[PDB]
Amino acid sequence: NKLTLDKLDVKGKRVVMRVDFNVPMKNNQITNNQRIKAAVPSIKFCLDNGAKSVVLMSHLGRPDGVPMPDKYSLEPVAVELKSLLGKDVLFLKDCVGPEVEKACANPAAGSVILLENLRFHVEEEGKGKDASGNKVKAEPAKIEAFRASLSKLGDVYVNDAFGTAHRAHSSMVGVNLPQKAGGFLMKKELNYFAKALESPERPFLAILGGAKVADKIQLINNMLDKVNEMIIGGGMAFTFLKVLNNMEIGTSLFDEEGAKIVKDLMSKAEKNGVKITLPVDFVTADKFDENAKTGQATVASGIPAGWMGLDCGPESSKKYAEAVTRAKQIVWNGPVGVFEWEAFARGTKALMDEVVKATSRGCITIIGGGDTATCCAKWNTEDKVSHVSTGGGASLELLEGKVLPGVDALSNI
Ligand SMILES: Nc1ncnc2c1ncn2[C@@H]1O[C@H](COP(=O)(O)OP(=O)(O)O)[C@@H](O)[C@H]1O
Numbered sequence: 001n002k003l004t005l006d007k008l009d010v011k012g013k014r015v016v017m018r019v020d021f022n023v024p025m026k027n028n029q030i031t032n033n034q035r036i037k038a039a040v041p042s043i044k045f046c047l048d049n050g051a052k053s054v055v056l057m058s059h060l061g062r063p064d065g066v067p068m069p070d071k072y073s074l075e076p077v078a079v080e081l082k083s084l085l086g087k088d089v090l091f092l093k094d095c096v097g098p099e100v101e102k103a104c105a106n107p108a109a110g111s112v113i114l115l116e117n118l119r120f121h122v123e124e125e126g127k128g129k130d131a132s133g134n135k136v137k138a139e140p141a142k143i144e145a146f147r148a149s150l151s152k153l154g155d156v157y158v159n160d161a162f163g164t165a166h167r168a169h170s171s172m173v174g175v176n177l178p179q180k181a182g183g184f185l186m187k188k189e190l191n192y193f194a195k196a197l198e199s200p201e202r203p204f205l206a207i208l209g210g211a212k213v214a215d216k217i218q219l220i221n222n223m224l225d226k227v228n229e230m231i232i233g234g235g236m237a238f239t240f241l242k243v244l245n246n247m248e249i250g251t252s253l254f255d256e257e258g259a260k261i262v263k264d265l266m267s268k269a270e271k272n273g274v275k276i277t278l279p280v281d282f283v284t285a286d287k288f289d290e291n292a293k294t295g296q297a298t299v300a301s302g303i304p305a306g307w308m309g310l311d312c313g314p315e316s317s318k319k320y321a322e323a324v325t326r327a328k329q330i331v332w333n334g335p336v337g338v339f340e341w342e343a344f345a346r347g348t349k350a351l352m353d354e355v356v357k358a359t360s361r362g363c364i365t366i367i368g369g370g371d372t373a374t375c376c377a378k379w380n381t382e383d384k385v386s387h388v389s390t391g392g393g394a395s396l397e398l399l400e401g402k403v404l405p406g407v408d409a410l411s412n413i
Pocket residue numbers: 209210211212234235236253309310311333334335336337338339340368369370371372373392
């Protein structure tokens with residue numbers, strides 16, 4: 001087991017906390033601050049328990065090892081943090097080097113400091129692109145020095161950056177202080193997924209949809225050993241329907257690599273008695289456009305040529321609803337339609353309503369982060385499901401049964 005924040009004595013201690021502040025932006029201004037909010041409990045705790053300082057560190061976007069302050073600065077996060085925290089947050093313009101080090105040697109008894117975006121330095125990811133756009137690899141010597149500089153900012157280290165936990169980056173596995181402790185966001189996320197995967201309340205339903213039909217492979221195969229039911233929705237379904245049922249799918253998303261094992265996966269489900277729910281009907285579109293001409297189809301009719309299926313239909317949502325009703329526990333990863341467009345958002349909307357009714361009655365509902373977490377924000381259901389993950393990719397690594405380098409890097413009790 002690992003050291004965690006509650007076990008950690010901070011009093012008088014400078015805390016360098018890795019957090020995931022990689023919030024969606026538009027035109028420099030934050031569109032979702034959930035990732036920020038989620039870190040608050042760890043930060044406050046340190047403040048309330050007498051920390052000399054919290055020096056926060058994160059990445060935003062993918063600047064690829066070149067500094068891009070015009071486009072990917074964390075400054076706006078500082079402003080949000082201070083508002084959240086009802087306290088001052090001092091933003092630094094770099095994350096390493098003498099100046100930053102001076103700022104972080106001995107702050108006051110409670111000063112919050114935010115570092116600039118980690119990824120401006122190629123040493124964080126260990127690789128990136130140079131200013132001319134060329135793929136480059138960072139240098140071991142330079143990587144150690146970078147790692148050393150982060151080390152100085154703090155007496156002790158805390159990782160609350162669950163969403164970045166799958167990334168073996170310098171700030172996540174390279175900060176070599178004596179005590180490295182997992183924050184409250186880390187413990188909470190890990191605990192939910194672990195409980196859901198190891199000892200779920202049953203029946204356990206996984207809802208898989210979205211697009212990323214191929215990446216959902218290791219995931220389904222693992223889930224197939226954990227679950228009692230699975231909805232396979234959204235873009236992914238079409239590959240299953242064409243293969244199993246010889247559906248005419250038009251221009252709908254199709255995944256050739258995926259089509260190869262669809263039969264294997266289905267037989268595994270049959271073996272395990274996992275009831276698989278695929279869509280039986282669809283909202284079609286004449287083109288991939290918000291204002292496209294719409295239509296309806298079924299597995300049996302096909303989708304016209306060469307229309308595409310962009311939402312499930314009414315029968316499908318009902319069958320989805322039947323599964324939600326039976327479930328004691330739900331993991332939902334991926335929307336079941338192109339929810340960003342009104343024409344194609346009904347199936348997702350109806351699924352959200354059902355999941356929401358289920359929470360209400362004690363079904364454990366876990367939402368996968370990424371696009372699904374986005375639906376919650378959009379529709380105000382963030383506080384009406386048991387947990388909305390802050391990490392899409394990291395959660396998948398977890399659902400896939402993989403280990404997280406961010407978790408592993410922590411100190412052992
Ligand atoms: N039938 C469909 N055809 C094409 N795109 C779809 C379909 N259903 C959902 N999508 C798209 O899938 C995306 C979500 O993909 P993904 O990243 O896998 O979900 P998440 O981020 O929740 O894990 C959205 O951009 C959505 O518009």
